[PDB]
Design a binder for this molecule. Structure first.
Ligand SMILES: Nc1ncnc2c1ncn2[C@@H]1O[C@H](COP(=O)(O)OP(=O)(O)NP(=O)(O)O)[C@@H](O)[C@H]1O
Ligand SMILES: Nc1ncnc2c1ncn2[C@@H]1O[C@H](COP(=O)(O)OP(=O)(O)NP(=O)(O)O)[C@@H](O)[C@H]1O
Ligand SMILES: Nc1ccn([C@@H]2O[C@H](COP(=O)(O)OP(=O)(O)O)[C@@H](O)C2(F)F)c(=O)n1
Ligand SMILES: Nc1ccn([C@@H]2O[C@H](COP(=O)(O)OP(=O)(O)O)[C@@H](O)C2(F)F)c(=O)n1
Ligand SMILES: [Mg+2]
Ligand SMILES: [Mg+2]
Lengths: 648, 648
């Protein structure tokens, strides 16, 4: 189709829905005027040959859901989409747009799907998720919340909703002899609304995540919300249950002690405090017989059966999240998000927003020596991270907010979330086993630099535009950075004294900056493995590109391989003519020590403002196994103990 | 249990929910202070022996759901409940309360269930239904409406909701390539909320009625909402579909012509006009090819199949309702209510309210001559109707409104709805066949007096408190009363010249006053047949009290009867030793000419401000039969062509 960018913008901007005779522009007024006023500079900036930097499936993903279409026909070329995003982000700052265009077109990084969809369009909703607070334990608060969720659902983005404050089943209701129906019937109302506000196009069906602390009396039905064999009307098939767990629960379980189930109305404040204060308030309520005591392990057993069967509920630690958040001065954080990476404050008048982008880790690998060997360019990584940090900052300002609570939240705290992809690819290119000592060090270094860089750029922005509204009084304002809250010394590749000094001096423009996300779709566009996890399989059919090369360079790649791989689930262990060095490098996530996965996750966590979507893979899932993985992650101090639990 | 009224009030007022330690009073502060300040006068006013004026099933209905309970134990005696209602209605006007107490305790009349439940209690929601308008064709308007319906559902009362303004399936949506899901998926959202806001106690499960004009493009799925064999997720099992039909549809059907289906967005204003203006606007839209043309009879056939199978959709005529409403100066009436008797104006900021009460028609029968024979006391009926009119007026002022839209509506137009019960009983006591010439005259007279009386008392109230806010400009302000709008002369038993003169002079306190309702439960308490319909059957087992007496006075009542009745569906026709005079008097509604039912309904309609719940009973339901019944009622000028369609 058409090549000239300014021309594609014209078509997209002048578009009319023929069947209705309604003008339906796919580009904002402001971005259109910016393209027209710089058509020469923008048109001759694009390198159309870079469109060949996408694999078959990569390109297909873009064509299928990303490239803007005109009457069902793809109107945009990948380069067109990238310049649109660049402009949608930087506006009149053309020099900034050109930089983002080249870096993105060269695959150094990319933005989240909502941004690739909507940046530069009339309703530019560029954020990935929203953390919504249940407004009030009332029919009015519940329906105001339902309305808010529906409006948010109109456009792109997932929702995280905490419901700790809702009255449990059988609870008393003043003004009637009836009693509360509890969480399930209310959850089912939300399930139904998620299915109705369907036509976002950009939107993914349900995509709702529910957060609940384990002491809520309706806890047992809540965790079984995704079973496909329940009592039928007690399930919520399109929503995801997530546990907001206090350390107290884990200790009682580990002690094989007791656990008490409370209706929030008969035991107020439990979600409005954490740590020691929560334990004192909980223990006290427990002694006064305000709830129903049970054996901690009884609840625990149901949790593992539910995860083993459905993969849910996710596990995120309430105390670790609150104790180690730079937003702790805002109040108590009552939830995470749909993908368990965002840890931001929310309230009835404030819905936290996810502003995402991921850095392409493999793009920093280079020979730079003599060849054969290859090194990692941390200096370049640092440089790009600062670029992305500025981008996500602009996004906060140019974003279209579906609801006022989301605007209020984002403008006040300006949280940001940089992530990664291609970690596995990186280790593979550098020929480093995922569970090796070298890979462990690289993991630490990469995250240390991205964190230093994001905070450095954020500090520069604070010098230019002032700190975010709630910066004063935050841990960062007192020189307490993320790793300090883990009581560790940074690795040291970068200078933290100077950065910390500058931060205390000038502050930072963003309250948070890190939150490695799943990148399920955006990683598919760049052709790398998802985020920070090992490859799930070494296998239209496509065998691991790196495994292929090596098997060819040994000639050993015949047909007794292509057939093996497909049969043994992309696994090459226990395979005859394959060097040990290759078996060690191309291990599958099912073949890697889940304990090593959790260590590296803990290592990089000291440099993560928020959290990260840690999926756990258990091949032979026994109860005791799954139990030690949870407690191992918990004692490791992780925030997100587990996102999805995948089995096989 | 306890006898002293003031004492029962004390217990009900001091009540504490033991399991919670929460004070939970069942009597308002104001009504409590009024009882305490007049305990002597109130206690010695009650005639406890009147509690024996209730049949077994009558009393049981009261005990089961009406008499206030304390910890699951009945605390109120029927007399206690009546004085509570009297006080709840009249407040400090003790003389008024005493009158209502005696008349109610003597069974001259009663108030609707919501009033018997809640009058005199802390949240006195005494109204029976609300007519709600879909706020806007937007996700926001839909969810604001959903919220409003949920809040209303918290307490007693049914809901009528018109959705003519919602975008049809496939309709275009600006800002996305997705298209509208249409009515069904939205209806299902409402169905789900009706099931969730369950714990009103006083409340009846779903109880939602939906109103839609037959030109809406989603009309075909809408009318099949109650089929128990549909595509499963296209049904709304707990909601009732009601058609808001324009004369144009009936004419096209009768002409075997065409009918066009429009999405309101591609054909605006259709529900915002009626009569000639609607036909001109409709015809015009039709010619401009804005919708999908079909054969009128195709839709018609589906309507009858749906009614024949489910008993729905109800049929209420849009043009007859609007053309003959005293509220026509407010704007276009877009719906009726759950029971098809209320015809009141509604809008986004105004939810019409049903304030109901029914007069016990048999209570005015008396020998007053010499015996054997008996006459009807219209003077007494008139007197009581004025009493009830004043009561429903007080209710409007002392009522608790669930939502602001309902308060705004009721305070502005002050609509009232008097009804009846025991019509069948009346004819039976007076030994008048339902389909006789005598019964026809009595029907006309009774309704003429209740209408004259309600308007007379309403006029007195206007002289005391001023006309309702929107009285000026109404048909009544121009001397146009209900029968004038049917272009008929009143029967004449009462003097209309003087009343009409006074009305034009001083106005009336209420915009509307008549709306004979089903009285399904309240009629069970007084022991009479429902509202204005013939007995459905002459048969714990209980044979018609009047049929019993007669069969005994002939001795012919043995056992070959009790056995017959139960077998022949309480029918005595084609029965050997029974005088023709008895067969004619005790005909069943299935044995009475549906055409005679519709005539008497048309006769009394000239004296009905709003409409009346006209159920239609067809024994051998063929299409052509059901068709002529609809067109016969339509040409008769009825507003409510049909409520439920019962078959057998
Ligand atoms: N009619 C109802 N049907 C279903 N759930 C209800 C109902 N009324 C209240 N609830 C539940 O009770 C809570 C809402 O009570 P809400 O309407 O705010 O209070 P209220 O009527 O003023 N009574 P209370 O909260 O005891 O003072 C929520 O957790 C609801 O799910
Ligand atoms: N995401 C959605 N999912 C399901 N139905 C939708 C969605 N968006 C809109 N609708 C339907 O479209 C109407 C609401 O559109 P609304 O949200 O008010 O308009 P909008 O987004 O501003 N688009 P438009 O009305 O064309 O200008 C209602 O009839 C909805 O049921
Ligand atoms: N097309 C998409 C893709 C993702 N998302 C949202 O981003 C979150 C996770 O994004 P991800 O998997 O890390 O990243 P991408 O699709 O942007 O690659 C989900 O919670 C989401 F709600 F699913 C979304 O709203 N729309
Ligand atoms: N216990 C009750 C009884 C009735 N109603 C409402 O009044 C309407 C009809 O009342 P009805 O049958 O004529 O009268 P009663 O129960 O008051 O005798 C329904 O639409 C209703 F929604 F069903 C109600 O809300 N609660
Ligand atoms: Mg409340
Ligand atoms: Mg709109």
């Amino acid at each position: 189709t058409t090549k000239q960018f300014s021309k594609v913008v014209e078509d997209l901007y002048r578009y009319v829905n023929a069947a209705t005779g309604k003008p339906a522009p796919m580009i904002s007024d402001d971005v259109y005027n910016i393209v027209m006023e710089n058509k020469d500079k923008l048109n001759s900036a694009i390198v159309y040959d870079r469109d060949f930097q996408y694999s078959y499936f990569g390109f297909k993903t873009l064509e299928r859901s990303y490239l803007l279409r005109i009457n069902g026909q793809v109107a945009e070329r990948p380069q067109h989409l990238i310049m649109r995003v660049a402009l949608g982000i930087h506006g009149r700052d053309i020099e900034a747009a050109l930089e983002t265009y080249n870096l993105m077109s060269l695959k150094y990084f990319t933005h989240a799907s909502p941004t690739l969809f909507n940046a530069g369009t009339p309703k530019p909703q560029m954020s990935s998720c929203f953390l919504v607070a249940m407004k009030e334990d009332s029919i009015e608060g519940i329906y105001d919340t339902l309305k808010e969720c529906a409006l948010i659902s109109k456009t792109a983005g997932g929702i995280g909703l905490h419901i700790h404050n809702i009255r449990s089943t059988g609870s008393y209701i003043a003004g009637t002899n009836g009693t509360s129906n509890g969480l399930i019937p209310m959850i089912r109302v939300f399930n139904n609304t998620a299915r109705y506000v369907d036509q976002g196009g950009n939107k993914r069906p349900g995509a709702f995540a529910l957060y609940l602390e384990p002491w809520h009396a309706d806890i047992f039905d809540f965790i079984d919300i995704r079973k496909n064999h329940g009592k039928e009307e007690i399930r919520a098939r399109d929503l995801f249950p997530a546990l907001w767990i206090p350390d107290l629960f884990m200790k009682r379980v580990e002690e094989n002690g007791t656990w008490t189930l409370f209706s929030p109305t008969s035991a107020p404040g439990l979600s409005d405090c954490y740590g020691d204060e929560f334990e004192a308030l909980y223990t006290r309520y427990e002694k006064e017989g305000r709830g129903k005591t049970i054996k901690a392990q009884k609840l625990w057993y149901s949790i593992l059966e539910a995860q083993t069967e459905t993969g849910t509920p996710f596990v995120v630690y309430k105390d670790a999240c609150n104790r180690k958040s730079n937003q702790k001065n805002l109040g108590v954080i009552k939830s995470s998000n749909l993908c368990c990476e965002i840890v931001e404050y929310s309230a009835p008048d404030e819905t936290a927003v996810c502003n995402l982008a991921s850095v392409a880790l493999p793009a920093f690998i280079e020979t730079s020596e003599d060849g054969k060997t290859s090194t990692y360019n941390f200096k370049k990584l640092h440089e790009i991270a600062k670029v992305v940090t500025r981008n996500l900052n602009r996004v906060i300002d140019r974003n279209y907010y579906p609801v006022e609570e989301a605007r209020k939240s984002n403008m006040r705290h300006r949280p940001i979330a940089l992530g990664v992809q291609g970690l596995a690819d990186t280790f593979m290119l550098l020929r480093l086993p995922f569970d090796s000592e070298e890979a462990r060090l690289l993991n630490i270094q990469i995250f240390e630099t991205i964190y230093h860089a994001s905070m450095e750029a954020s500090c520069e922005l604070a010098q230019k535009d002032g700190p975010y509204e709630t910066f004063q009084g935050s841990p960062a304002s007192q020189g307490i950075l993320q790793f300090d809250m883990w009581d560790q010394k940074p690795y040291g590749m970068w200078d933290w004294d100077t950065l910390r000094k500058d931060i205390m001096k000038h502050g930072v423009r963003n309250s948070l900056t890190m939150a490695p996300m799943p990148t399920a779709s955006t990683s598919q566009i760049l052709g790398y493995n998802e985020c920070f996890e090992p490859v799930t399989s070494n296998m239209f059919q496509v065998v691991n590109p790196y495994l292929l090369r090596d098997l060819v360079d040994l000639g050993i790649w015949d047909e007794g391989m292509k057939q093996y791989l497909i049969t043994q689930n992309g696994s090459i262990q226990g395979l005859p003519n394959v060097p040990q060095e290759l078996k060690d490098l191309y291990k599958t996530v099912w073949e890697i020590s889940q304990k090593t996965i959790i260590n590296m996750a803990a290592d990089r966590s000291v440099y993560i403002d928020q959290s990260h979507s840690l999926n756990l893979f258990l091949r032979a899932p026994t109860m005791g196994k799954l139990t030690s993985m949870h407690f191992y992650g918990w004692k490791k101090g992780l925030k997100t103990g587990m996102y999805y639990l995948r089995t096989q």
